[PDB]
Design a protein around this ligand. Structure first.
Ligand code: NR6
Ligand code: NR6
Ligand code: MG
Ligand code: MG
Ligand code: MG
Ligand code: MG
Ligand code: MG
Ligand code: MG
Lengths: 236, 5, 236, 5
């Protein structure tokens, strides 16, 4: 790997610089290098990893959606034939997106998840696994679409099971996991009722535990609670 | 699109 | 080149798709492929080329400025030594920026400028040449800084000379050239008086010719006139 | 920074 010659600490330093510069591809490459050193990641370092790849794949997903919409419109009655270019370019973006997802999944499988024993780390990585399978599912249309969806579900479910046993209902990782799994149900699994039930139960159980929190923990938890409420408002 | 984190 | 096997028309089609998707690196790569077909560019195609590279280099310049500021702060009294990483990463971004500038300059030199005989095309390309030498100047600190600055000046000057002979004072290319050459004077050549004089004279001569224009041409010219006024307000 | 086009 191109980062093999750089010190772990220097990769982490540079990932932080890249974030400040809004250079998210660089940020992700630095963090991939850091993971490949083989040591476990701290909380802060896990956050750097997630932010980097979230921003890279988020841009790819937005571009894919633009291109997919143009492609769909081209396939409507009365649309003039414009050749293979729209499909080709959507495919190009799609392949690059899949590549990023496969990279992240690969880091999780080799060997972040297996080394993660604390609930906070293990849930964080399993949530990521669910998220990147969900991104693969968004673009999947073939023989494997069901298996990709099931991979996302399985990762999310393991993360939910651990989170419910090991973390308080206000824990931001638990909350963010539930938020995203709820979106999986609504957008990927064709299960809007499950999505709504999860979001509501998660919100309500968090509400009941806010009294235990410091001001700073309260801020963190309530931020994600508001995202749950925002989705519920969208869906009801 | 719905919110995720 | 990786675009050598793609039809010119398909490259142009895909550049437009990439713009819609805000995929400016792809857009630039498509347009580079299109230029390398060897045919002259239409007005619309020149605009695609410029938009693509403006957006790519603009992002690099913004990142470079963030990193340069962090580096400068590190070199102040009382700043803790943090090692070579800030300089290294600023250098990385800088080298990539220089590469993009050299690519654009290369397209202009091989062979866009030499084939451009109409004033609108020739001025457009010479303005680009000035602009990308200006970007090189922004980051230059060595033996060649003066020659880089002079290259920008020379390109801008040739474009100004043609524009004044061949184009009306409201022509948007003429206006945009003057806007940018004025910024060159202020920011690169340490000539704020020349910058202000150019912006003022350009604005006033345009104002006097607006009466000749259709509504749509008026909109185009007045947009750039407002940028001139905005700079004048900043500088006075 | 000043405006350019
Ligand atoms: C190591 C660790 O505790 N990481 C999770 C925290 C990162 C910062 N947080 C947030 O920005 C908010 O919640 C998030 C963000 C991302 C995820 Cl994956 C989950 C929750 C409040 C937005 C708190 C958790
Ligand atoms: C072929 C040609 O006439 N190109 C220049 C036009 C592009 C669209 N225009 C604009 O968007 C505005 O002026 C610009 C933009 C870029 C440049 Cl390099 C110069 C002027 C009004 C913003 C009009 C000129
Ligand atoms: Mg070491
Ligand atoms: Mg495909
Ligand atoms: Mg359940
Ligand atoms: Mg051909
Ligand atoms: Mg250098
Ligand atoms: Mg003069």
């Amino acid at each position: 790997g191109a980062m093999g010659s750089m010190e772990r600490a220097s990769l982490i330093q540079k990932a932080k610089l890249a974030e400040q510069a809004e250079r998210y591809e660089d940020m992700a490459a630095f963090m991939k290098g850091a993971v490949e050193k083989g040591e476990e990641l701290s909380c802060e370092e896990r956050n750097l990893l997630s932010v980097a790849y979230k921003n890279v794949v988020g841009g790819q997903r937005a571009a894919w959606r633009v291109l997919s919409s143009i492609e769909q419109k081209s396939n409507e009655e009365g649309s003039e034939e414009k050749g293979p270019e729209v499909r080709e370019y959507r495919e190009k973006v799609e392949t690059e997106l899949q590549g990023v997802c496969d990279t992240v999944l690969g880091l999780l499988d080799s060997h972040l998840i297996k080394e993660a024993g604390d609930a906070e780390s293990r849930v964080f990585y399993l949530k990521m696994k669910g998220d990147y399978y969900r991104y693969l599912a968004e673009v999947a249309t073939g023989d494997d679409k069901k298996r990709i969806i099931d991979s996302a579900r399985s990762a999310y479910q393991e993360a939910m099971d651990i989170s419910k046993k090991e973390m308080p209902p206000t824990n931001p990782i638990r909350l963010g996991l539930a938020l995203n799994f709820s979106v999986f149900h609504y957008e990927i699994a064709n299960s809007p009722e499950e999505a709504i039930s999860l979001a509501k139960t998660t919100f309500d159980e968090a509400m009941a535990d806010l009294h235990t929190l410091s001001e700073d923990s309260y801020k963190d938890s309530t931020l994600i609670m508001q995202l749950l409420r925002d989705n519920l408002t969208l869906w009801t | 699109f719905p919110a995720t984190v």
